[PDB]
Amino acid sequence: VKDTYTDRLDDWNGIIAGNQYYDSKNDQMAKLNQELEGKVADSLSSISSQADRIYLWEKFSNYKTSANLTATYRKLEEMAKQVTNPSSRYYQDETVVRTVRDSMEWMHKHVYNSEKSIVGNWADYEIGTPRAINNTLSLMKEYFSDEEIKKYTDVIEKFVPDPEHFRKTTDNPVKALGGNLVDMGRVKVIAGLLRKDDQEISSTIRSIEQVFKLVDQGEGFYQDGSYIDHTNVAYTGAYGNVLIDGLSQLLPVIQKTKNPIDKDKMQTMYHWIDKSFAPLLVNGELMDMSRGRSISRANSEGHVAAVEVLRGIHRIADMSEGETKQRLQSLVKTIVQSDSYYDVFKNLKTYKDISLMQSLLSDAGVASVPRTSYLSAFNKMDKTAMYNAEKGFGFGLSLFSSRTLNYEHMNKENKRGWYTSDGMFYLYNGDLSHYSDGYWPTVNPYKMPGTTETDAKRADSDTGKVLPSAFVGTSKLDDANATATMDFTNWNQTLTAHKSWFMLKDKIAFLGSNIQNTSTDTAATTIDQRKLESSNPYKVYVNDKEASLTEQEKDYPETQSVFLESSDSKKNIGYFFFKKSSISMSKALQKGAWKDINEGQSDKEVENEFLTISQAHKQNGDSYGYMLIPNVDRATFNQMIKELESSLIENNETLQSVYDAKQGVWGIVKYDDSVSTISNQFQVLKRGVYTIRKEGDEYKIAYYNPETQESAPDQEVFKKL
């Protein structure tokens, strides 16, 4: 016989593989089956035979490399999936059953057991390998005895005895939080089910419930939608993913144990979806500024990573009811249907996930309406996300401060992310492929768009830093208008700039002042570095006259505008310089390999064409100022820039401000507490960041002091004249 522990493991099997839902007449499901057939075939044809060898697989044979342990066990999990799939050529196959049984024994005696110590990466010993061991035994529980299942999980209890801590067998344990604490549940709740151990189950679930608390310091989800991991890194889009993806798998199982989670406690998940995740999803892409070092992974470009989030959301929708279920279904549906570039099924890796998505997309009762405009100021992780639904573009602003690390270079990944938070911007337009198809290994990492830098050489071996200043932040007025600033100093304290951004509904102004350089390296701001499509070329205009770009840099003194014209208006990009400026532009093929930025990736050469625009800063006290205007045609851009001719109010070392006369909206950044008079209409009085609207005789005010992370009473900061 068997019991309620195995009943839970049946449910787990339906979630992690879903063989009960397989239908050979289902096109998408058959594609995933064929992928698994191929992987099992490959593994079977290379596992080693005769004379108790030095290695199960030759390619994962160095057991001092910890990644080789979990790649090995993951190969056994793939076998367990197919051996229990009635439609697989390996269903109930004698050789496969014995291979998994005997392979677990071989690794157990020579490689991974209680008598061992972590060699290499702890995450493989405590997460990657134990998850793969657990799922294998769960799927194939009808081919193992309880005593063998105990025996092969004993090593999990040696490396991971305590559901509140990772690295327990090291000298320096760590408190389990965030994505890693959900992985604690996928390790210890499943091992606890296999081992029939009620204390492990309950103690692990109790530890997991810490995940539902919003924090105001340290790692976790914040009220304002920010997510921090690795002490002080913006991380919604990699560790946050793992959290929602893993939790949404576990919850249907946890909720049928003897220790279910209170529904009250779980309500915070809906806050994560609406406040943290949704704003970072644009046309099916998860914004790279939230993904940390995972940008350097070829198999995890932004549309692919997005599906980790979407599949989690859809599982949460499925365990919800009524209006909560309906609205989450609609959110997934509209995001997926907006993505003309990536096929969501390419990252749905179980049959239940495929089945859910198919029924969602074909259910006429689930509304799918284009997402409306929004603007999220994630001040607790120094990021801002903006989306305009009318014109159809998104914008991401990637900053850091005294409170956050600029970039994560860890585990030999993201070696050239140096400037990815130095006031870097992202534009999400009709080219859904822009940050994909090898953007990251081919972009020139010295000229990240928006950033002001010197041309000094940088070392791959460097790691991230916090910013000296806390004067970094965004004041949001409404869903369309916000202002941000960053009191910028570069990595070696040779360059400063007061960089500010004025998000004004359908355009963004970029102002920089107080640009100073104490090195002998040259300084410049990259206005853009845009990855091109050979199928959809741009016609380039400078001051409304066609220009011919080349690989070699061409200088354009006295530039008032640049316009990049596509056949598709939703890919158009214009740049309006408030004061005539001296810029340089080039169009060049850039080559590189993923291995250049991540040691674990392929050395295969990749290439893309980029259009680079920059502005040199040869003197102390230099400045820049321009308006980015996307998604309009050439005639409309030319009309808009005439309307904006007097939009620059000030751009100096203490005051930066831009005015949108059409909307009646001002953005203002003050670096001191002087009285600043604006448009002979009003005064602003305090250092900080402002977005202000005039409606009749009335003014709507949004003020933020980024240093104290507080607003202030209207009369302290604003006076109508």
Question: What is the CA 236 to chain-centroid distance, rounded?
Answer: 6
Cα(639)–Cα(9) distance, rounded to whole angstroms? 64
Amino acid at residue number 466: V
Q: How long, in residues, is the chain?
A: 721
Cα(17)–Cα(431) distance, rounded to whole angstroms? 34
Every domain of the chain with CATH number 2.60.220.10 lies at 636-720
Provide the annotated active-site residues: 180, 230, 239
- The residues facing 529 across adjacent strands are 612
Cα(107)–Cα(532) distance, rounded to whole angstroms? 48
Q: Enter the CATH code of domain 636-720.
A: 2.60.220.10
**DSSP helix/strand/coil, 279:** helix
Q: Which of 121, 100, 258, 289 is nearest to 193 (CA)?
A: 258
Q: 698: how many CB neighbours lie within 10 A of its CB?
A: 8
Every domain of the chain with CATH number 1.50.10.100 lies at 2-373
Helix axes 4-16, 239-254, angle to 10 degrees: 140
Please identify, in words, the CATH class of the domain defined by 2-373.
mainly alpha
Give the DSSP H/E element, type plus range, for residue 545.
strand 545-547
Position of tokens 């998940």?
Answer: 269
Give the DSSP H/E element, type plus range, for residue 275.
none
> Residue 507 in contact with residue 514, Cβ under 8 Å?
no
- The residues facing 683 across adjacent strands are 677, 719
Please identify, in words, the CATH class of the domain defined by 379-635.
mainly beta
**SS3 assignment for 341-362:** CCCHHHHCCCHHHHHHHHHHHH
First-to-final CA distance of the chain: 84
Under DSSP, the state recorded for 2 is: -
Cα(166)–Cα(181) distance, rounded to whole angstroms? 9
Cα(571)–Cα(565) distance, rounded to whole angstroms? 8
> Residue 508 in contact with residue 626, Cβ under 8 Å?
no
What Å resolution does this PDB entry report?
1.5
**Pairing mode of beta strands 220-221, 227-229:** antiparallel
Every domain of the chain with CATH number 2.70.98.10 lies at 379-635
> Residue 643 in contact with residue 627, Cβ under 8 Å?
no
Under DSSP, the state recorded for 702 is: E
Cα dist. 603→295, 398, 409, 595, 610 in Å? 16, 28, 19, 5, 21
In whole angstroms, how large is the CA radius of gyration of the chain? 27
